[PDB]
Design a protein around this ligand. Structure first.
Ligand SMILES: *[C@@H]1O[C@H](CO)[C@@H](O[C@@H]2O[C@H](CO)[C@@H](O[C@@H]3O[C@H](CO[C@H]4O[C@H](CO)[C@@H](O)[C@H](O[C@H]5O[C@H](CO)[C@@H](O)[C@H](O)[C@@H]5O[C@H]5O[C@H](CO)[C@@H](O)[C@H](O)[C@@H]5O)[C@@H]4O)[C@@H](O)[C@H](O[C@H]4O[C@H](CO)[C@@H](O)[C@H](O)[C@@H]4O[C@H]4O[C@H](CO)[C@@H](O)[C@H](O)[C@@H]4O)[C@@H]3O)[C@H](O)[C@H]2NC(C)=O)[C@H](O)[C@H]1NC(C)=O
Ligand SMILES: NS(=O)(=O)CCCC(=O)N1CCN(c2ccc3ncn(CC(=O)NCc4ccc(Cl)c(Cl)c4)c(=O)c3c2)CC1
Ligand SMILES: [Ca+2]
Ligand SMILES: [Ca+2]
Ligand code: NA
Ligand code: NA
Ligand SMILES: [Zn+2]
Length: 805
């Protein structure tokens, strides 16, 4: 109950919300149906529109008008945004030449440059170029400030998950807003875009920027807006707040536009109807910039122009129906559209079974336009599993398509021609980033980056300490003129042992055999040098990885590769080797096909054993450094050391063997040499973080050998490919992957075909950032390079997406 009988007189757009049952006058009161009786009359004035005209100049103030052109409006802070242009001979901001803002030029009483975040829903990255002729204000921000060619949203590429990620720096699985619609089984409650449940703070985790600011004594209200407040009134309200007295004025402001998303759903991303919404958003930016220029703030404020996601062509005819696959379609609840989430309709139905649902949805139709996954099997780059609100069964829907439960869902709901939500690497889902102001660089283009990084930069812009988040603080330092965050490398926690030869062959009883008993002072000292690290500068190009947790491990050197061998997990944490452009691929010789060799540097008690693999009828093994890439027939023996072996399902070995035999050499040819670091990952609780030993759910039968959930590789070369990977003078180039270690290839519908037709496609889907691997392994890479630490942080956040232009 609201006592709407109170009044908004002197309170319009108050920043402190008042508590029930008292009526409200803040920018959210409409959403709650709680505005005072006179809020429209007092706070939503519209008389005479939003622009000054010649006849209004020097008018006698009339408090009914939406905005003012009287002589007193500048001191009242409530002129129409074009007042100085119409009445005082001034130019529009867009018509002024751009001039570098080398220092903030702020009025007295300003303690720091304010930050204004201007968020545009559904603003596809390519609009910046394709729409540039009709968006002169935005084009001036972009060209004069700092811009990326695109910014990558989080998955799912929906509004609320992305706007809340922008505000918190967190993945949706950690902030909790994991879709526009959600069921939380603990709350037993549902969240929707429409309605009031979403007002309850229990859904919204993390610490959004307005709260971070407020806790540290920087004034900031929430970034939400009631939809019925027109954009022109939102801009005027921002300009009015900026005219508050020093002690009352916020330092951070947010404008939100429901366009171009609204029209894009109706018309498609490039519908001819889309020009007008882009014009209208540009006009709104022009109002803000003109208004700042009136207030002498246009060379003081930092402005961020940022989108939440793009928009793809999607029509009702491109819908897959689960009723065409499942017999039991009435026993499931589907969250539908550009992604699918499936759970049981009734928790009382114990004949519901996810295994049979996944199987009924896997590769059933030749052109199938969605792929089912248990959430833990989704690509790790999506970071979309560790939340009870994310259903165990997920459908990744092809771009341009929808999934629905039954046909009647789609016509008892063609209306729409655009939609979004798909995989966040999809080109149509990319969105925009421009930063303009004293703290941003001048006329600077930066590489594409992810939106999870922006919270830290906004904290830097405001002098705030960010709450713990998923950005990598410092990775966007190259966007900023000043206020950079100079991170230090994390301290290594465990130092390695460097074992020498300490065991005789007969001390091992591993059940392994190798035909290696076939026998020189020149080449004995040489092999001894290799075991002491003489080739290490060739194969470990960027220093050894640092181990950032407590563990027991050994560094093992070899002619062709170096590894960090874990005495706890009985296998390497990492294996590093360089393959030059000139490297030759060879076979595993016949007599060495089943060869595994005890490593006389490592105790039998800390080694794997062949008998475990013989006995585990499900599990085979592979090697981290590939025998195919040995430098000589004699060095090849090192590749069959028990310390280079890792457990692999036979179905996974098809993938791994093709990567090692064919693709590494292909990359070395294309990139002019590559350095490869490969290793296992254990993430049985799917939290994106390294498992401790007591979290391992599966071992090689009858042994303490843990089975990885994934295998990674990080593939590094010189950005200037005229220089070989091992003699690189400048910046680096990287691609990485985190492949799921699965006992079938049900994910790859074409797996019955030769690996050349499906394996690289699998790998591309499971592309990763080095930072993703760092979280999953507790390792810190690139510790010894000639590059600045911020540049290396940017390199660790890079994702190779395999999308075209
Ligand atoms: C992305 O960045 C984020 C932010 O840095 C990373 O997430 C952090 O990761 C930590 C590890 O997973 C996690 O630390 C845990 O915090 C527990 C206290 O949690 C509360 O307090 C914090 C701080 O204010 C708060 O942010 C939390 O918010 C979560 O929960 C609420 C709902 O309750 C949500 O609204 C919110 O969205 C968020 O949910 C997310 O995180 C939780 C886990 O906290 C998930 O369950 C959700 O699905 C969702 O993803 C909380 O309100 C603390 O209790 C933990 O301590 C346990 O483990 C330690 C290890 O040191 C052990 O020593 C302790 O004994 C303890 O164990 C006991 O509890 C166990 C569980 O019941 C039990 O089994 C044992 O037997 C013991 O009794 C732990 O320290 C931190 O909370 C999150 N923060 C956030 C915001 O998500 C994220 O990892 C990054 N991602 C990647 C890929 O890098
Ligand atoms: N973690 S915490 O404890 O600090 C709690 C944080 C959440 C919170 O403060 N509330 C309290 C206020 N609630 C609320 C009330 C009225 C509303 N009226 C309109 N709209 C539409 C809109 O603004 N869309 C654009 C939009 C802009 C920014 C973003 Cl980030 C997002 Cl996602 C969407 C709303 O979303 C809306 C929301 C949400 C929960
Ligand atoms: Ca949106
Ligand atoms: Ca884990
Ligand atoms: Na076996
Ligand atoms: Na298959
Ligand atoms: Zn939308």
């Amino acid at each position: 109950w609201t006592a709407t009988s109170g009044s908004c007189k002197g309170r319009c757009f108050e920043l402190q919300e008042v508590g029930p049952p008292d009526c409200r006058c803040d920018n959210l009161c409409k959403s709650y149906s709680s505005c005072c009786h006179d809020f429209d009359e007092l706070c939503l004035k519209t008389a005479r529109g939003w622009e000054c005209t010649k006849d209004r100049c020097g008018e006698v103030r009339n408090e009914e008008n939406a905005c003012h052109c009287s002589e007193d409006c500048l001191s009242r802070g409530d002129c129409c945004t074009n007042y100085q242009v119409v009445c005082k001979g001034e130019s529009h901001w867009v018509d002024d030449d751009c001039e570098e803002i080398k220092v903030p030029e702020c009025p007295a009483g300003f303690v720091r440059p304010p930050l204004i975040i201007f968020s545009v829903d559904g603003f596809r990255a390519s609009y910046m170029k394709k729409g540039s002729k009709v968006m002169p204000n935005i084009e001036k921000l972009r060209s004069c400030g700092t811009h990326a060619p695109y910014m990558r949203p989080v998955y799912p590429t929906k509004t609320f998950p992305n706007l809340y990620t922008l505000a918190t720096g967190l993945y949706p699985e950690s902030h909790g807003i994991v879709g526009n619609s959600m069921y939380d089984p603990v709350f037993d409650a549902s969240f929707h875009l429409r309605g009031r449940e979403k007002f309850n703070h229990r859904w919204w985790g993390g610490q959004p920027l307005w709260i971070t600011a407020t806790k540290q004594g920087v004034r900031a209200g929430t970034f939400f807006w009631s939809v019925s407040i027109p954009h022109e009134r939102r801009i005027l309200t921002i300009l009015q707040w900026l005219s508050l007295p020093d002690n009352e004025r916020p330092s951070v402001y947010a404008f939100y536009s429901e366009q171009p998303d609204f029209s894009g759903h109706k018309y498609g991303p490039f519908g001819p109807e889309m020009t007008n919404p882009l014009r209208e958003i540009d006009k709104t930016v022009g109002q803000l910039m003109d208004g700042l220029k009136q207030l002498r703030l246009h060379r003081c404020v930092n402005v961020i122009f940022v989108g939440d996601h793009g928009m793809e062509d999607v029509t009702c005819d491109r819908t897959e129906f689960l009723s065409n696959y499942l017999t039991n379609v009435d026993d499931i609840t589907l969250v539908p559209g550009t992604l699918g989430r499936i759970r049981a309709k009734s928790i009382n139905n114990s004949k519901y079974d996810p295994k049979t649902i996944i199987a009924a949805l896997t590769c059933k139709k030749p052109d199938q336009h969605f792929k089912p996954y248990m959430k833990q099997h989704l690509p790790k780059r999506l970071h979309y599993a560790n939340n009870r609100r994310i259903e165990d069964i997920h459908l990744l829907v092809d771009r341009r398509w929808h999934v629905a439960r039954k046909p009647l869902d789609v016509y008892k709901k063609c209306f729409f021609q655009g939609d979004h939500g798909f995989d966040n690497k999809v080109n149509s889902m990319q969105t925009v980033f421009v930063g303009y102001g004293p703290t941003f660089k001048y006329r600077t283009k930066v590489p594409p980056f992810e939106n999870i990084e922006l919270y830290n930069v906004m904290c830097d812009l405001l002098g705030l300490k960010p709450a713990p988040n998923n950005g990598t603080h410092g990775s966007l330092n190259h966007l900023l003129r000043t206020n950079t965050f100079r991170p230090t490398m994390p301290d290594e926690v465990s130092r390695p042992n460097y074992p020498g030869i300490m065991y005789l062959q007969s001390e091992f009883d591993l059940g392994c055999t190798c035909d290696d008993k076939v026998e020189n002072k020149l080449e004995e000292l040489n092999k001894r040098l290799h075991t002491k690290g003489s080739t290490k500068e060739r194969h470990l190009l960027y220093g050894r990885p640092a181990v950032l947790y407590r563990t027991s491990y050994d560094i093992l050197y070899h002619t062709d590769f170096e590894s960090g061998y874990s005495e706890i997990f009985l296998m390497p944490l990492w294996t590093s080797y360089t393959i030059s452009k000139q490297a030759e691929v060879s076979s595993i010789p016949e007599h060495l096909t089943n060869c595994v060799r005890p490593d006389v540097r490592v105790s039998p008690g800390f080694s794997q054993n062949c008998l475990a693999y013989k006995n585990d009828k499900q599990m085979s093994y592979g090697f981290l450094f590939p025998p195919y890439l040995s430098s000589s027939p004699e060095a090849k023996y090192d590749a069959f050391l028990v310390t280079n072996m890792v457990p692999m399902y036979p179905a996974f070995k098809r993938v791994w063997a093709y990567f090692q035999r064919v693709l590494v050499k292909k990359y070395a040819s294309e990139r002019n040499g590559v350095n490869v670091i490969s290793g296992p990952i254990f993430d049985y609780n799917y939290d994106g973080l390294r498992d401790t030993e007591d979290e391992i759910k599966q071992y090689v039968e009858g042994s303490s050998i843990p089975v990885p959930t994934h295998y990674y590789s990080i593939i590094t070369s010189c950005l200037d490919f005229t220089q070989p990977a091992d003699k690189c003078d400048g910046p680096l180039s990287v691609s990485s992957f985190i492949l799921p270690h699965r006992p079938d290839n049900d994910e790859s519908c074409n797996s019955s075909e030769d690996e050349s037709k499906w394996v690289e496609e699998l790998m591309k889907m499971h592309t990763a950032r080095v930072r993703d691997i760092e979280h999953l392994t507790g390792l810190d890479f690139y510790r010894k390079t000639s590059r600045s630490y911020s540049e290396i942080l940017t390199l660790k956040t890079y994702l190779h997406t395999y999308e075209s232009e």
